[PDB]
UniProtKB/Swiss-Prot annotation:
Subunit composition and interactions: The nucleosome is a histone octamer containing two molecules each of H2A, H2B, H3 and H4 assembled in one H3-H4 heterotetramer and two H2A-H2B heterodimers. The octamer wraps approximately 147 bp of DNA. H2A or its variant H2AZ1 forms a heterodimer with H2B. H2AZ1 interacts with INCENP. Interacts (via M6 cassette) with ANP32E; leading to removal of H2A.Z/H2AZ1 from the nucleosome. Heterodimer H2BC11 and H2AZ1 interacts with VPS72 (via N-terminal domain). The interaction of HZAZ1 and VPS72 is enhanced by VPS72 phosphorylation which is promoted by ZNHIT1. Interacts with PWWP2A.
Protein family: Belongs to the histone H2A family.
Task performed by this protein: Variant histone H2A which replaces conventional H2A in a subset of nucleosomes. Nucleosomes wrap and compact DNA into chromatin, limiting DNA accessibility to the cellular machineries which require DNA as a template. Histones thereby play a central role in transcription regulation, DNA repair, DNA replication and chromosomal stability. DNA accessibility is regulated via a complex set of post-translational modifications of histones, also called histone code, and nucleosome remodeling. May be involved in the formation of constitutive heterochromatin.
Record's protein name: Histone H2A.Z
Post-translational modifications reported in the UniProt record: Acetylation by the NuA4 histone acetyltransferase complex is required for hematopoietic stem cell maintenance.
Segments forming a coiled coil: none
Localization per record: Nucleus; Chromosome
Length: 50
DNA sequence: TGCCGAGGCCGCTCAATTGGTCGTAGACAGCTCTAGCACCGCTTAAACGCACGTACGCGCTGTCCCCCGCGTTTTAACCGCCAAGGGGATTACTCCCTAGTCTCCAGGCACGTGTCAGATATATACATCCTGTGCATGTACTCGGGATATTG
């Protein structure tokens, strides 16, 4: 049974659709997995203010 | 009449700009770096651009049908003005304080290297999440009639 990384952060937003998005805006180099979990929850958190 | 009074043209003297000449001091141009490490040339096995009916989606098209535009003029005060008054923004000076220079002096840390790890990428298998689709009601809407608020 697969989990989802959204549940391990505790977030409603898609932590793995981000990551794949960031990996397309990246010079020629990679992106840490712990970036998607404070990339998200600093896009959610504008929702629930907007 | 008178007188003269009031009247209208021309060399000193001073006070900014303007352009000139003096001399001297770092800072610019250039050399040789030399030195080295990037550009190139030379292969390779490579990804990704690209020239090209057809299904067909929608951009554009020929109609009628009405408000908001279009036109007028009264007026209404908005907006402009001028002139006066008061002060507060301004000017010119004297005293004053520190901005700025230099110089000495230390160690803080930004700089740099020296090793090599926990990081994240990439593959394959894959299950699952998420999209596109199809599908009832529930509301937010437009209307009509009356109450409350506010303008003149």
């Amino acid at each position: 049974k697969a989990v989802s990384r959204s549940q391990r952060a505790g977030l409603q937003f898609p932590v793995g659709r981000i990551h794949r998005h960031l990996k397309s805006r990246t010079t020629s180099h990679g992106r840490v997995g712990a970036t998607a979990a404070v990339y998200s929850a600093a896009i959610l958190e504008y929702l629930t203010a907007e």
